[PDB]
Protein: Lactonase GcL
Amino acid sequence: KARPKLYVMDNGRMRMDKNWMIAMHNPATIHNPNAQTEFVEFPIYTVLIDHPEGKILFDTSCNPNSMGPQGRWAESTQQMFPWTATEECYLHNRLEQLKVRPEDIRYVVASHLHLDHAGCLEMFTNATIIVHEDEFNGALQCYARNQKEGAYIWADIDAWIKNNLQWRTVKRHEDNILLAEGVKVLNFGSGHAWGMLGLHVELPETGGIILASDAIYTAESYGPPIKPPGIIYDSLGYMNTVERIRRIAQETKSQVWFGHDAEQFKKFRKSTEGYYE
Amino acid sequence: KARPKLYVMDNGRMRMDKNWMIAMHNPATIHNPNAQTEFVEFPIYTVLIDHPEGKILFDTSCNPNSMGPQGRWAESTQQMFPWTATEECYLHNRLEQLKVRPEDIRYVVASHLHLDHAGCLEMFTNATIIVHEDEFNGALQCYARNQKEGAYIWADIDAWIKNNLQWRTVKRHEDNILLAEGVKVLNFGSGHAWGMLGLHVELPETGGIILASDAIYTAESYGPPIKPPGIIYDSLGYMNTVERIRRIAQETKSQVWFGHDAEQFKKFRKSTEGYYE
Ligand SMILES: CCCC(=O)N[C@H]1CCOC1=O
Ligand SMILES: CCCC(=O)N[C@H]1CCOC1=O
Ligand SMILES: [Co+2]
Ligand SMILES: [Co+2]
Ligand SMILES: [Fe+3]
Ligand SMILES: [Fe+3]
Structure:
């Protein structure tokens, strides 16, 4: 029958230029030539699926040692994308509170390898890390070219390699993957980043849930109409992916969980209050 | 053997949010959370090639009845993308000063069908209008859907149809087109817009010139590295096109004439001073 529990874990808050999230949200005009943007706050979160076939983790938030003078993040990154989180927000702690040790995780699904999703991959040395092959390649290049700024953290990648993580790459033209009963990895491909993965979870009580991650930032992104983010890798791929998610949602009667929607996140039942069955 | 003359015609100035031109040019930070943008000015220009095989026109600037309360442009468009031009800047007049009547143009190459490139297509009823099939399709849909805002001017398209222009669409996968001796239409495809066309001109005295139009806004866009515009239709297509242009430039020892580079345009010899042979 399979009766898993799905947990939403609060991994703190991030701020950044609204223009990153919604491209040209407030363009300058003849009467407002020096138009001002805003510095919006949004949640960073991860999802644990306590499944009888094994524990599945979607995204891993930011590394505890990201911010500060001795942080892994470049100063420019910290100033443009500041992450704030109490100690109880760290992924290791959120898992501990559920009496889950990193070594208990069978599968980690990395939606992508941005600094706010792949922060703690290095913990799960007993898991198979599932990632898009193009995203993996892209990140490894950033590392090889000794890129010290941008959304791919050199020090994080460094740790992945040293900790000898076990990778299973999703091929560009690879079908969706049945990870477990009612759990499907969605191959979104290029869009927001080089290679995006999603989850479709079918819960006996709650029903269908799509984890879109950064494929869809917020409800505003989702529309319709679609309001794309400030910087995109593959604009065409991004638009296709959103509409693909909308279709799947309609066809399977599934909720869509956005990557960084403050309003939606407030309404989630977090790991401090319970779970979804 | 062919000894054409190429004219750069000044069709006025436009202003818009700098973020349109260079995506995230000045992102908000923790110390500057309400970062301000700028309202940059840039030139609108067209190119006439007086060729023995016939007169070739690249782009057609804006329509004279674009701006104002009884203008073709929507109010929001006028406020975000204001076009300023004296009467001598109108395309019809620039051509007249060269003793060229619209009926004298054999070929018009529409780089794309944005408001600042396809403004005056409706004049050239005696020409073959060369346009990318995807761009044409895109514009005709805006018309059919009665889209009154955006970069595709309903009234302009209306006039094209009423004036019974003769179209030659460049197919998505169509090779470059030899328009005349030393004049080649470059199929850039999707990028900035649905379908971008460029021109490669080989001048006996001046040598190779690539007309990039909005494939490359400015020298800053060109880099390297590449700094893409704020809104893009096909980001992947855009990046490839830029690098394709760089390659062609290097392989053929050609100058690259950007779409809206104030500095570059300053240095051009305009139709009021002469031409390029
Ligand atoms: C795409 C570069 C900007 C970036 O990395 N943004 C972060 C903030 C939250 O979602 C993200 O991916
Ligand atoms: C796509 C950005 C909005 C737009 O159409 N801008 C115009 C002004 C400069 O050349 C353009 O393409
Ligand atoms: Co991301
Ligand atoms: Co344009
Ligand atoms: Fe993110
Ligand atoms: Fe333009």
Remarks:
- The CA atoms of residues 62 and 119 of chain B lie 4 Å apart.
- Chain B has one domain: 1-277.
